[PDB]
Amino acid sequence: GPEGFQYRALYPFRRERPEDLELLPGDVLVVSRAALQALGVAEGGERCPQSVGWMPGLNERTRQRGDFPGTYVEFLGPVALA
Ligand SMILES: [Cl-]
């Protein structure tokens, strides 16, 4: 199976915590399967980010990593990683 998943931010998120990840609408985020497994997301729950809650991820526009709310993003599908 796929090493990761892509999401697209739909709504701006301003960092609240040191480890938060800033979002602007249209930002593509990559989340690794290892990271969802590690949070105990059950197989295929990646398709409902509103249910995962907060996720760690790479924001491709900023190049930063950190935590962001799944309710601010839509699932795009599976990807290869760097
Ligand atoms: Cl801050």
Side-chain angles (χ1 to χ4, degrees), residues 25-50:
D27 287 356
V28 179
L29 315 161
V30 181
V31 171
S32 57
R33 183 182 201 190
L36 305 152
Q37 273 156 21
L39 284 173
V41 182
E43 280 314 329
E46 69 280 356
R47 290 183 282 266
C48 299
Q50 70 263 59

Side-chain angles (χ1 to χ4, degrees), residues 15-18:
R15 290 169 59 254
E16 300 164 355
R17 330 207 166 156

Side-chain angles (χ1 to χ4, degrees), residues 24-73:
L24 289 172
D27 287 356
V28 179
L29 315 161
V30 181
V31 171
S32 57
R33 183 182 201 190
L36 305 152
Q37 273 156 21
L39 284 173
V41 182
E43 280 314 329
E46 69 280 356
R47 290 183 282 266
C48 299
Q50 70 263 59
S51 273
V52 168
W54 293 77
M55 284 186 273
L58 165 72
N59 176 322
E60 318 232 70
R61 188 257 309 173
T62 72
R63 224 79 252 216
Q64 309 296 90
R65 299 195 157 276
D67 299 319
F68 63 96
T71 58
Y72 291 34
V73 307

